[PDB]
Amino acid sequence: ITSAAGIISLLDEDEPQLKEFALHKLNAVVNDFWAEISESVDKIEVLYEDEGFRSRQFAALVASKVFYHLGAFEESLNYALGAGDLFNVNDNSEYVETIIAKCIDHYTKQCVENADLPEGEKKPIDQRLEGIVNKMFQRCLDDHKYKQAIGIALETRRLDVFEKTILESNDVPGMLAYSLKLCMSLMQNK
Amino acid sequence: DDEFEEFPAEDWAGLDEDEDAHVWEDNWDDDNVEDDFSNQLRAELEKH
Amino acid sequence: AAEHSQRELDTVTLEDIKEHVKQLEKAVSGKEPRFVLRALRMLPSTSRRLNHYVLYKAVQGFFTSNNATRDFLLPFLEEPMDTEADLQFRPRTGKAASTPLLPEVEAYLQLLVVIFMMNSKRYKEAQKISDDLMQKISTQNRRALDLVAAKCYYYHARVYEFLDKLDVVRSFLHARLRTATLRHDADGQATLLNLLLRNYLHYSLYDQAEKLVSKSVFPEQANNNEWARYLYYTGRIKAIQLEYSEARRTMTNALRKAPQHTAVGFKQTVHKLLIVVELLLGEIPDRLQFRQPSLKRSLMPYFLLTQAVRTGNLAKFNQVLDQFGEKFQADGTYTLIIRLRHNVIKTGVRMISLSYSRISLADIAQKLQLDSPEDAEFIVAKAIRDGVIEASINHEKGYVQSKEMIDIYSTREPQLAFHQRISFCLDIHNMSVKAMRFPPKS
Amino acid sequence: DLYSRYKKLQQELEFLEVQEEYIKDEQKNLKK
Amino acid sequence: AATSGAVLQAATGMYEQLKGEWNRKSPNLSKCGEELGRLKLVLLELNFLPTTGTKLTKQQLILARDILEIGAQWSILRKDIPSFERYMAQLKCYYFDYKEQLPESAYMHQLLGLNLLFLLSQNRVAEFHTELERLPAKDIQTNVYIKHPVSLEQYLMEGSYNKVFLAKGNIPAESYTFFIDILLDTIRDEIAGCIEKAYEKILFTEATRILFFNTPKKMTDYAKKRGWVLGPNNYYSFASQQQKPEDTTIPSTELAKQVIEYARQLEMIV
Amino acid sequence: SGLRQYYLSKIEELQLIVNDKSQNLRRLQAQRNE
């Protein structure tokens, strides 16, 4: 409650047991004290960087949370990628939703910019981003909403996942007519 | 309008009547207590 | 006899509420969110005059689609005292009655309900309905609903303050601010920033507020009023810290941006804080205000205070501080007036600099009723360090020398100032010709 | 489906941009 | 619970051991340090920093409060600022957020004022005053223990440097005595800065005289640290001219862009 | 339930932009017609 300076202050101490409770407390109390922790964001970045820390992923998650709340969405996206597995895709939360959307957008932008390039100089894509997008593909399929998965596949230019979603369908000829229509419809690249 | 009813005005408990209510121009210097300028001149002359 | 007049007043208010709902409907249909702001200008007049009869008839007619909202709204409303000439106000006709009410109209109705439950000293029920309304709004997502949502958050804050539970809602306001700044609303963002600053002040938590303000960005398109509130809070937070000049500047901007006629209390607040900050800055605020009718008796403490600061007399300063002490504390400034009490010398030294182009330090000591001239020496040096005065000390002769006057025009300052103002004027024109709508083919 | 609505809106946006630029040009030439 | 009671009893026994250790005329200053190091991990279990008011066991919070107060005393007496500030970080919350139910400490005022004096000594006047805001009014002009920081700061605001330097002799508690020195050095840097920004070619009745040095040579090292020419004896130039910027070159590219932009906005269709 | 909220927010952005643009174009057409 208030102040919220100590939980920060209990972080320099080189005792990797107080660091953990400080981390979880900052998580629990970030939503109302993101600003203050943002002033002290360098410390948590250092802590994440230190591989010795066991709970590095939780630190990366907290760093993404504070960066996201700040407004700087690129740093938040990078560190959210760094959060690894703890990025529970299945949280009906504002943060998770906005960050996944930002991720889909960046992946689409990279894919479009990379498609029209030689095989020599394809910009590498983060594996964490790829994992998150594939997870979102899996969620979309499992919900059974084929149309959304097809659309994300097209925008991202991914033809493999498009092919998957095309086959694993209870309305194969119907959604195949859908696909042809969309092809002759307002999509331009030749 | 957006009347700042949030903010309170001043209480009217005392509300003493205006002492003189003069409205000419106020001015800051009128508060100072001088010494009857003629008196200062006379004292100067006495002291030279 | 007055009952008939009250009845006519109720009928005209019912028609007026019909008009506001019509305006909201037009706004929702026509893709013009600003059209609600017409619907949201007469709220104070409505609240100052509303009545239970009007509220009952409105909720009865407008909520034709009897929904759990109706069951939650009616019971609090007192029923008419054996009304016999009831006209059965039926705003919704045929299809309109059958169809669901628009989210914005329903939000506006809940707003009138909570306001009426606020005017009466009945805070618990008002708070209950307000939580319900907040849940409702958060559940939905719409634009004109967002514009009304602005004032819904303002009234949620007002009720939570009137219940003295300001802390407990900090997280709700924070998440609401986050969603708003994610969704690109302007007025909602301004409202939620202002409310968060008010919450932070209520508990004199200044360091947290400083971080918050330093990190978020005020949208450049708000009202006059939300700009005034943001500016006041930022001015107060600075004055509490040590950046006096910027606090003075932000405050004067606010006072110059407030509504002209209303906000007597607001003007009082800003003026008293401005007086205190200027005094803290070594200048002398002008005497014109003190005799203004709307601030005459609300500043007498400060009138005596300045009379004391000029002709510095610690006896008189102590007399006035002591006598009008509880009042200063009540205002929320006492700390600053104390910061003054040990800076009464500064006015004198600034005066000495303005008046003299070079004076011996011993003369300063004689003029300031000080001890040995070393004390005045040190005070002057610290002053020039602070930037309040422009001079140069030189003891080998033993006189402090003021710096000459430099020619501002020859420099490039005039070009810069006129460029800024010209840019502002061209922007005004582009906006003005943009605002035009030629709908004759409406 | 919502994908189709999305592409429709995006193409509507492109068309509106083209028309706006054309009207600016038309006004500039009509002055002359 | 049984485990909760056992851990609370263990923590209380440890705290009693410490209070017995510290109350001695001559503490050890090392065993106590290691002991605090181990206790930090102990307080972890018992809701070290509860997130909500949710009035819990008064004993746990009181124990943490005493642990923090003794930890802070330990830090100061050990002449380690980082520890003092770290501890104060949580202690201010404990003192402030939870006092709605938890009774006040006996060392409340002394140690808040100790931190305020530290702040003052660290040239952080903005923080000095932000904290001064938090507390009530009566303690400020009534509490002798907090009277020192406020009064000394008022003396510094009034430029009065002799009064502050002489005011050392009167002190609320002996613990502060370490930070009086840091405040003195801080104000010494402040007077050096005042002299540098102010004045023209030294003087002020000789440097050591207004620098309040017992020995004339004591200032040589400090003058060396700063960028002073070290001219004739007690005669050092501060270079108040600041190069007297007079050169002007008519920046044009900016002006040309500005004017072309006026013309652009003037002729575009809006 | 699948990625709807993202489609929804993004379509909301496009809708706001397109509405503002349509108003601008209406004004501009009115001027050109005059």
From Swiss-Prot, chain A:
The gene is PSMD1. The chain holds residues 2 to 191 of 953 of the full protein. Component of the 26S proteasome, a multiprotein complex involved in the ATP-dependent degradation of ubiquitinated proteins. This complex plays a key role in the maintenance of protein homeostasis by removing misfolded or damaged proteins, which could impair cellular functions, and by removing proteins whose functions are no longer required. Therefore, the proteasome participates in numerous cellular processes, including cell cycle progression, apoptosis, or DNA damage repair. Component of the 19S proteasome regulatory particle complex. The 26S proteasome consists of a 20S core particle (CP) and two 19S regulatory subunits (RP). The regulatory particle is made of a lid composed of 9 subunits, a base containing 6 ATPases and few additional components including PSMD1. Interacts with ADRM1. Interacts with ZFAND1. Belongs to the proteasome subunit S1 family. This is 26S proteasome non-ATPase regulatory subunit 1. It comes from the Eukaryota.
From Swiss-Prot, chain B:
Expressed in limb bud, craniofacial primordia and skin. One of its GO terms (biological process) is double-strand break repair via homologous recombination. The keyword tRNA processing does not apply. Keywords: Nucleus, Proteasome. It is found in: Nucleus. GO terms for cellular component: cytosol; integrator complex; nucleoplasm; proteasome complex; proteasome regulatory particle, lid subcomplex; protein-containing complex. Component of the 19S proteasome regulatory particle complex. The 26S proteasome consists of a 20S core particle (CP) and two 19S regulatory subunits (RP). The regulatory particle is made of a lid composed of 9 subunits including SEM1, a base containing 6 ATPases and few additional components. Belongs to the TREX-2 complex (transcription and export complex 2), composed of at least ENY2, GANP, PCID2, SEM1, and either centrin CETN2 or CETN3. Component of the homologous recombination repair (HR) complex composed of ERCC5/XPG, BRCA2, PALB2, DSS1 and RAD51. Interacts with the C-terminal of BRCA2. Belongs to the DSS1/SEM1 family. This is 26S proteasome complex subunit SEM1. It comes from Homo sapiens (Human). The lineage of its organism: Eukaryota, Metazoa, Chordata, Craniata, Vertebrata. The gene is SEM1. The chain holds residues 16 to 63 of 70 of the full protein.
Swiss-Prot record, chain E:
The keyword Phosphoprotein applies. Residues 82-251 form the PCI domain. Keywords: Isopeptide bond, Phosphoprotein, Proteasome, Ubl conjugation. GO terms for biological process: proteasome-mediated ubiquitin-dependent protein catabolic process. There is a cross-link at K217 (Glycyl lysine isopeptide (Lys-Gly) (interchain with G-Cter in SUMO2)). The modification Phosphoserine is found at S26. One of its GO terms (cellular component) is proteasome accessory complex. Component of the 19S proteasome regulatory particle complex. The 26S proteasome consists of a 20S core particle (CP) and two 19S regulatory subunits (RP). The regulatory particle is made of a lid composed of 9 subunits including PSMD8, a base containing 6 ATPases and few additional components. Interacts with DDI2. Interacts with TASOR. Component of the 26S proteasome, a multiprotein complex involved in the ATP-dependent degradation of ubiquitinated proteins. This complex plays a key role in the maintenance of protein homeostasis by removing misfolded or damaged proteins, which could impair cellular functions, and by removing proteins whose functions are no longer required. Therefore, the proteasome participates in numerous cellular processes, including cell cycle progression, apoptosis, or DNA damage repair. Belongs to the proteasome subunit S14 family. This is 26S proteasome non-ATPase regulatory subunit 8. It comes from Homo sapiens (Human). The lineage of its organism: Eukaryota, Metazoa, Chordata, Craniata, Vertebrata. The chain holds residues 81 to 350 of 350 of the full protein.
Swiss-Prot record, chain F:
It is found in: Cytoplasm; Nucleus. Component of the 19S proteasome regulatory particle complex. The 26S proteasome consists of a 20S core particle (CP) and two 19S regulatory subunits (RP). The regulatory particle is made of a lid composed of 9 subunits, a base containing 6 ATPases including PSMC5 and few additional components. Component of a complex with USP49 and RUVBL1. Interacts with PRPF19. Interacts with TRIM5. Interacts with NDC80. Interacts with PAAF1. Interacts, in vitro, with the thyroid hormone receptor (in a thyroid hormone T3-dependent manner) and with retinoid X receptor (RXR). Interacts with ERCC6. Belongs to the AAA ATPase family. Component of the 26S proteasome, a multiprotein complex involved in the ATP-dependent degradation of ubiquitinated proteins. This complex plays a key role in the maintenance of protein homeostasis by removing misfolded or damaged proteins, which could impair cellular functions, and by removing proteins whose functions are no longer required. Therefore, the proteasome participates in numerous cellular processes, including cell cycle progression, apoptosis, or DNA damage repair. This is 26S proteasome regulatory subunit 8. It comes from Homo sapiens (Human). The gene is PSMC5.
